[PDB]
Amino acid sequence: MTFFLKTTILMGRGSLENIKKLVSEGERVLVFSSKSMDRLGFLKEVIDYLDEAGATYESITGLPSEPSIENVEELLPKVKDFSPETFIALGGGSVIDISKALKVFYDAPELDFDSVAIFSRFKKAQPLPKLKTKLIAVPSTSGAGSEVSAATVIKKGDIKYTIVSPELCPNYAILDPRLPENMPREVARNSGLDVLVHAIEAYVSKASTPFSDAMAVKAARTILEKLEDSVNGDPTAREEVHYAATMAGIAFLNGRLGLVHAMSHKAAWIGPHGLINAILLPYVMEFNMEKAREKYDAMAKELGLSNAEELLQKVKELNERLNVPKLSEIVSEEDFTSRLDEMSRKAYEDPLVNFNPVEPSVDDIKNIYLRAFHDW
Amino acid sequence: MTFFLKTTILMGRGSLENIKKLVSEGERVLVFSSKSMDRLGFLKEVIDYLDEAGATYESITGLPSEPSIENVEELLPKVKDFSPETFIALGGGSVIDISKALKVFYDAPELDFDSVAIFSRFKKAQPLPKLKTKLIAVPSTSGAGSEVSAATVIKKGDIKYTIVSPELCPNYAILDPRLPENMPREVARNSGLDVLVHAIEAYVSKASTPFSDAMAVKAARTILEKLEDSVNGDPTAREEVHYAATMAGIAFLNGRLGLVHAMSHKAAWIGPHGLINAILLPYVMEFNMEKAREKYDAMAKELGLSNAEELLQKVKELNERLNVPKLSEIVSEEDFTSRLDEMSRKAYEDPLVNFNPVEPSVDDIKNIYLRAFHD
Ligand SMILES: NC(=O)c1ccc[n+]([C@@H]2O[C@H](COP(=O)([O-])OP(=O)(O)OC[C@H]3O[C@@H](n4cnc5c(N)ncnc54)[C@H](O)[C@@H]3O)[C@@H](O)[C@H]2O)c1
Ligand SMILES: NC(=O)c1ccc[n+]([C@@H]2O[C@H](COP(=O)([O-])OP(=O)(O)OC[C@H]3O[C@@H](n4cnc5c(N)ncnc54)[C@H](O)[C@@H]3O)[C@@H](O)[C@H]2O)c1
Ligand code: NI
Ligand code: NI
């Protein structure tokens, strides 16, 4: 049992200004940004800080959502050409994950994706050498927790795979609630429910400790109390949920995740995106609560509920109040059916299955997917 | 507003065996331990792991509690003689604090104590350069939180001063509850109440964040619920309180401490040791609550109490039930009244005052000490 944190976290409204203090005169900085963070003026704000710092900088913008290995490879020549000492990742989990993947392939150019990505928990991946490029993560959602995690989630053939290394942990995270105050309702809802998924999975993980549990319970408490207020546009709730998103990231960095993310990774072919975690969570909770009820009971008591059954009800009621669609509403029975057997096999191979409080069969995973689809 | 943790925390019963993982063949390792960690056979367990790792090692034992700069200077030549790459600090806050002070003076031999210790918050101390000696902190009490903190607490002339630098944060902390299970009742009480002092001062600190607050509340909740069970020999509660001490450590690494530790640093000339933080806490809370109730109320409600007034009552009741002495049991009215003025002046200059929710005068600190003596 281990607990660490590689990331120095700076927080508060206006904390984006810290960039001035983190970068030195003549430091070679490459800024990666989403279309959102460009349009909304946050990229300009970072450039003006780098200008005041007298840094040597360049900006790559309009990084895509749900990044592929092809997305990464297309950016890599620009990276090598500029020869940065420092990355700033301004945007969502998508932008922070693109930057982590570029950090690997820039700092360790002997390593290709196919050598380090965990395609199957039954096949060895190469560990990462020391990666010297400084990474400053500035999340715009609340949130993926990528600003502290050891993982980058990259698609190859419409399946999400991970590279996981403590070397990928961002050197610095800046948590400036001014950014997420700009999320559209559905982005605030989806990324806020991912916090709750992260917190519950980290708490019931085989890898859980009291240290990860303290962060996981507080993040979960904040989502259950504050998320509806944040989705309605309460700035105080937007701050609390932004910090809860990172608290859950600290939890799952140490505690790891579980079946929910193994099954959402391998259901990335489904649109809309960023729904499937929220939808699958209760079905995975009900499966795990069969043989491994104990840690769900423990978390429910810590959250001031009587038992695991009441925590499950609170999760289903929050999803209901935030109008999370049924799986059957966002995928046809034929398309779901034709991909089910391979999805279930690929999910079973995902390394997050090793942390799940119960070891699933392929058939157990297939039956969880079916249960979520039927919604009988 | 910042949150970090430089230390990798390894935990569980038998986690002491991780030493065999963290040390490579031919690594030069210097082990510091207390007499109790030698006598109870934890030093032999560590040497046995270093032997299995094929390390080049040496052991220094019989390290004093409440260490001085003279203590540290007397050991420095033995450190230089052996030329270690790695320290293992096996014992209480005292042993980890000695190990931290030696890491400064070994790694930066151009810096003396008088250049890096914060004698006064009104005068610059030198910042520390990169210190490359790896430090593995194995706390035996529950506890100082020194195994994750950026601080070492060293006496000069019977007053506690600090060196504070992220460079002093141990590389690794091993939390193995077999060690603190051996604490006699009084040591379990004193170090446990220190956790609660740490947790409350970190929460109400001017440098509090939601991250440090989460660690501080869970640490405080564990002490209020479990410390009596632990004092009474409950192995579950010993484990819980051991991890609570490090949580309060994470909390104060970030949040810092306040007027309780400023006042206990400058009252270091009182024996016994370890009581003064627990004695002073309620009086400092009452002082701070007059002007800055807000964070005490927030902490009370997090702990599922109705208000700041009830948290204060719960602290006072715990001290009562675990038989914390009054200040006038452990110091003559002669002694006290004679040093009160200079102690108050020197507590006022302690950098930890900068983090207290309320800026005290010297006279305020004088009157807190007076209310403690006169209860
Ligand atoms: N590496 C990890 O540990 C980890 C953990 C969980 C998820 N992920 C990955 O992260 C990705 C999802 O990241 P995400 O949830 O942050 O979303 P995202 O980065 O994919 O962005 C979602 C959408 O919201 C928009 N947006 C983001 N912030 C905005 C803001 N403040 N104002 C306006 N619009 C804004 C984006 O432009 C985009 O259209 C997925 O690829 C997922 O697999 C990573
Ligand atoms: N550096 C920091 O951040 C920090 C924080 C708090 C306190 N401190 C310092 O730490 C010191 C106090 O540390 P402490 O409270 O851990 O006590 P300690 O290290 O002074 O030891 C107290 C006594 O208990 C004995 N003991 C300790 N563990 C035992 C065990 N498991 N079994 C049997 N006997 C045991 C010791 O041998 C000693 O006699 C003080 O000098 C204080 O100023 C520093
Ligand atoms: Ni997620
Ligand atoms: Ni203390």
Tab-separated table of N, CA and C in Angstrom, chain A residues 1-12 175 209-211 214-215 218 243 246-247 250 302, chain B residues 1-12 175 209-211 214-215 218 243 246-247 250 302:
chain	number	residue	atom	x	y	z
A	1	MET	N	0.863	-1.237	0.000
A	1	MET	CA	0.000	0.000	0.000
A	1	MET	C	0.878	1.258	0.000
A	2	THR	N	0.634	2.148	-0.953
A	2	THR	CA	1.471	3.337	-1.237
A	2	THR	C	0.551	4.545	-1.400
A	3	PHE	N	1.070	5.727	-1.081
A	3	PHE	CA	0.413	7.022	-1.358
A	3	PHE	C	1.494	8.040	-1.719
A	4	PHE	N	1.337	8.650	-2.888
A	4	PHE	CA	2.206	9.759	-3.331
A	4	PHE	C	1.383	10.804	-4.071
A	5	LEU	N	2.079	11.890	-4.373
A	5	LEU	CA	1.594	12.968	-5.253
A	5	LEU	C	2.816	13.647	-5.879
A	6	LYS	N	2.973	13.555	-7.199
A	6	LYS	CA	4.142	14.122	-7.925
A	6	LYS	C	3.910	15.606	-8.204
A	7	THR	N	2.655	16.046	-8.174
A	7	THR	CA	2.216	17.343	-8.740
A	7	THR	C	2.207	18.368	-7.609
A	8	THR	N	2.720	19.571	-7.871
A	8	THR	CA	2.495	20.749	-7.017
A	8	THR	C	1.228	21.426	-7.529
A	9	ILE	N	0.212	21.542	-6.673
A	9	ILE	CA	-1.126	22.105	-7.019
A	9	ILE	C	-1.192	23.566	-6.562
A	10	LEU	N	-1.404	24.483	-7.508
A	10	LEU	CA	-1.724	25.914	-7.255
A	10	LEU	C	-3.197	26.152	-7.592
A	11	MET	N	-3.896	26.879	-6.729
A	11	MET	CA	-5.366	27.014	-6.826
A	11	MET	C	-5.793	28.440	-6.478
A	12	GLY	N	-6.997	28.807	-6.908
A	12	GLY	CA	-7.695	30.049	-6.536
A	12	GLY	C	-8.075	30.808	-7.790
A	175	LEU	N	-5.356	25.227	-10.718
A	175	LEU	CA	-6.818	25.048	-10.559
A	175	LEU	C	-7.441	26.425	-10.342
A	209	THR	N	-6.207	3.128	0.151
A	209	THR	CA	-5.626	3.372	1.497
A	209	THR	C	-6.470	4.413	2.229
A	210	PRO	N	-6.231	4.638	3.540
A	210	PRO	CA	-6.895	5.745	4.241
A	210	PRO	C	-6.594	7.130	3.628
A	211	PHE	N	-5.396	7.286	3.063
A	211	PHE	CA	-4.909	8.544	2.433
A	211	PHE	C	-5.719	8.852	1.163
A	214	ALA	N	-9.559	9.456	2.067
A	214	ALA	CA	-9.903	10.795	2.609
A	214	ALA	C	-10.215	11.755	1.448
A	215	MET	N	-9.398	11.721	0.397
A	215	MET	CA	-9.610	12.525	-0.830
A	215	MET	C	-10.859	12.006	-1.582
A	218	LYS	N	-14.224	12.964	0.327
A	218	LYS	CA	-14.536	14.416	0.247
A	218	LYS	C	-14.979	14.785	-1.178
A	243	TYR	N	-12.243	21.776	-7.443
A	243	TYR	CA	-11.258	21.239	-6.473
A	243	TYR	C	-11.582	19.773	-6.170
A	246	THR	N	-9.964	17.437	-8.704
A	246	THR	CA	-8.533	17.140	-8.443
A	246	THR	C	-8.418	16.213	-7.221
A	247	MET	N	-9.255	16.385	-6.193
A	247	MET	CA	-9.235	15.484	-5.008
A	247	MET	C	-9.456	14.048	-5.480
A	250	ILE	N	-6.228	12.771	-7.203
A	250	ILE	CA	-5.294	12.280	-6.151
A	250	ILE	C	-5.719	10.882	-5.684
A	302	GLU	N	-19.226	6.809	5.803
A	302	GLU	CA	-18.347	8.013	5.849
A	302	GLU	C	-19.114	9.221	5.296
B	1	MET	N	-1.960	29.898	-2.634
B	1	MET	CA	-2.687	28.671	-2.202
B	1	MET	C	-2.082	27.451	-2.914
B	2	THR	N	-1.336	26.631	-2.175
B	2	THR	CA	-0.512	25.521	-2.712
B	2	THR	C	-0.816	24.228	-1.946
B	3	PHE	N	-0.752	23.094	-2.642
B	3	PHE	CA	-0.745	21.752	-2.011
B	3	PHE	C	0.274	20.868	-2.738
B	4	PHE	N	1.199	20.302	-1.969
B	4	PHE	CA	2.196	19.329	-2.470
B	4	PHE	C	2.469	18.277	-1.393
B	5	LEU	N	3.155	17.220	-1.829
B	5	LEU	CA	3.697	16.125	-0.984
B	5	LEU	C	4.936	15.561	-1.670
B	6	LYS	N	6.111	15.825	-1.115
B	6	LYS	CA	7.389	15.364	-1.722
B	6	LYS	C	7.658	13.905	-1.345
B	7	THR	N	6.959	13.360	-0.350
B	7	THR	CA	7.302	12.049	0.255
B	7	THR	C	6.445	10.975	-0.418
B	8	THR	N	7.049	9.841	-0.744
B	8	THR	CA	6.306	8.603	-1.060
B	8	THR	C	6.045	7.856	0.242
B	9	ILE	N	4.765	7.649	0.562
B	9	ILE	CA	4.298	6.945	1.792
B	9	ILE	C	4.001	5.489	1.434
B	10	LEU	N	4.735	4.585	2.081
B	10	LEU	CA	4.531	3.119	2.102
B	10	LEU	C	3.969	2.733	3.470
B	11	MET	N	2.956	1.870	3.510
B	11	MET	CA	2.223	1.593	4.770
B	11	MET	C	1.811	0.125	4.849
B	12	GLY	N	1.290	-0.255	6.013
B	12	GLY	CA	0.777	-1.596	6.335
B	12	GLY	C	1.631	-2.230	7.411
B	175	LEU	N	5.144	3.683	7.193
B	175	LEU	CA	4.176	3.652	8.323
B	175	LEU	C	3.808	2.197	8.648
B	209	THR	N	-6.039	25.196	2.700
B	209	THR	CA	-6.764	24.980	1.424
B	209	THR	C	-7.726	23.820	1.628
B	210	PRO	N	-8.640	23.573	0.663
B	210	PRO	CA	-9.528	22.412	0.748
B	210	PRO	C	-8.774	21.070	0.793
B	211	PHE	N	-7.594	21.006	0.169
B	211	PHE	CA	-6.737	19.796	0.118
B	211	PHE	C	-6.159	19.520	1.507
B	214	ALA	N	-9.014	18.605	4.042
B	214	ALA	CA	-9.524	17.215	3.947
B	214	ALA	C	-8.667	16.288	4.830
B	215	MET	N	-7.343	16.422	4.769
B	215	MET	CA	-6.400	15.587	5.559
B	215	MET	C	-6.552	15.929	7.050
B	218	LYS	N	-9.965	14.584	8.707
B	218	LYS	CA	-9.956	13.109	8.885
B	218	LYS	C	-8.992	12.760	10.031
B	243	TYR	N	-1.718	6.363	11.010
B	243	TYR	CA	-1.967	6.981	9.689
B	243	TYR	C	-2.554	8.387	9.877
B	246	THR	N	0.316	11.005	10.134
B	246	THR	CA	0.880	11.367	8.806
B	246	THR	C	-0.135	12.226	8.043
B	247	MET	N	-1.443	11.979	8.190
B	247	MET	CA	-2.455	12.848	7.530
B	247	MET	C	-2.282	14.280	8.055
B	250	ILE	N	0.677	15.749	6.423
B	250	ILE	CA	0.372	16.281	5.062
B	250	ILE	C	-0.331	17.636	5.223
B	302	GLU	N	-17.751	20.249	9.899
B	302	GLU	CA	-17.134	19.119	9.145
B	302	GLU	C	-17.085	17.878	10.048
